[PDB]
Amino acid sequence: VLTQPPSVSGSLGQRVSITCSGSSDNIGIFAVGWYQQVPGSGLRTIIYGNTKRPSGVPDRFSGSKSGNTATLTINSLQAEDEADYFCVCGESKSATPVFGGGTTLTVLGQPKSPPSVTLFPPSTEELNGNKATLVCLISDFYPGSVTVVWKADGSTITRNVETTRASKQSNSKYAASSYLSLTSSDWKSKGSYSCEVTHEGSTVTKTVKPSEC
Amino acid sequence: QVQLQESGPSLVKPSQTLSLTCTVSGFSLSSYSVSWVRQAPGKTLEWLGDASNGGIIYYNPALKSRLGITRDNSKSQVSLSLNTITPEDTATYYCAKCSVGDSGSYACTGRKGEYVDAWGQGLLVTVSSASTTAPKVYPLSSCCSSSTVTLGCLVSSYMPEPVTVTWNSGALKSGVHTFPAVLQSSGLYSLSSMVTVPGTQTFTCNVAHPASSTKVDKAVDPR
């Protein structure tokens, strides 16, 4: 697998770049291409063979490669360029193509906004069924990416966490939610749980304590 | 106008066989290779295989024992079957048309040659063992600290989408924020709706689930 940053921001009319990184087994030897996936829509081939644009792709898109890295460069950024961008490369060892994880590009079009976080503990009614679901609701953030970290008594929790992708709100900011699904015994077996939502380096955290609810 | 369209079941049970068909238009199928790619709910792209215009079918070796890909030139269709599925096969499935010419691209087949120049719409297929299931509705409250209490309802464990949520039969609209659903590892969806309000007012969420012909009203106590 190749590595590209999860997200990037740019300004209208100006230049942004997205770099994809691998090893001398893929990017050093073989050609790299770039796909554009526009929100709630399909894939579009932007670049093939390191530098080439298929017919109909505007020339403000360009590709390049140096060493074990490849780069998609977009000049004169337009709103329509907001998309997820994926690199693709050949692999010497394997037979398949390999892909980067995708870089989500935001073209800044409204004020940046931190997320509001509400964390709900499990209900008594749910605890009566011996199940406990903590609900973390995240709203009003812009740009539309956050990362969610769950903690119990200070330790990071990964299992039985389901987090949605961000989705556009009707006021053009973004929302998401995250669910921690436990049994009632698990829930009672910790002193405190926290939902920690980070957005552009700043983390917003909410906490619930079983002893208090 | 070059065009590719995936079709097949959008909901499949584990251990069954996922079968998709790709129907193409605006080009001569027999003249071009067609690849299958899939994208998991949050993850990256995974190449499945290619039905090359020479008659050779290339498979992702990690999935070869589960994959089948065939070509039907006389119907302008390429097909994919995937057996012994598990929830890990939930993904949006794409067929894609390759170029014709020796670039230095590996995107089409596994090997040096053509790139992908046109993408199908993509078909989201959900793998879940669950049949149609009405939701359980649980009240949500922040009773564990400001002066404006936040309430909600957890619409838990239903299938399939969608549900609709209102509060006080639609009389309460400002402050309501209903969120898109999550698909849990149980194979069922859940979503939450939240209301924030600034002393005898009561709050009831009305959850409707058309597929199971169910409507649930749950009173939420703003203690």
Residue numbers in the entry:
A (entry chain L): 3 to 215
B (entry chain H): 1 to 144, 148 to 201, 206 to 230
Question: What do the authors say?
Answer:
The F protein epitopes recognised by mAbs B4 and B13 are conserved in both human (h) and bovine (b) RSV, and are a major cause of lower respiratory tract infections in young children and calves, respectively. B4 recognises antigenic site II (residues 255–275), whereas B13 binds to an epitope contained within antigenic site IV, V, VI (residues 417–438). Exchanging the LCs between the Fab fragments produced hybrid Fabs: B13* (B13 HC/B4 LC) and B4* (B4 HC/B13 LC).
Comparison of the structures of B4 and B13 with their LC exchanged counterparts B4* and B13* showed that paratope of the HC variable domain (VH) of B4 was disrupted on pairing with the B13 LC, consistent with the loss of binding activity. By contrast, swapping the B4 LC for B13 LC leads to large changes in both orientation of the B4 VH domain and conformation of the H3 loop. The VH domain of B4* differs by approximately 10° in orientation relative to the VL domain compared to B4 VH. On exchanging the light chain from B4 to B13, the H3 flips around to include a π-interaction between Tyr100C (Kabat numbering) of B4 HC and Phe31 of the CDR1 of B13 LC. In addition, the orientation of the H3 loop changes from the sequence running clockwise when viewed from the top in the B4 structure to anticlockwise in the B4* structure. The area of the interface between the variable domains of the B4* Fab is lower than that for the B4. The large conformation change that occurs on replacing the B4LC with B13LC radically alters the conformation of H3 and this disruption of the antigen-binding surface is consistent with the loss of activity.
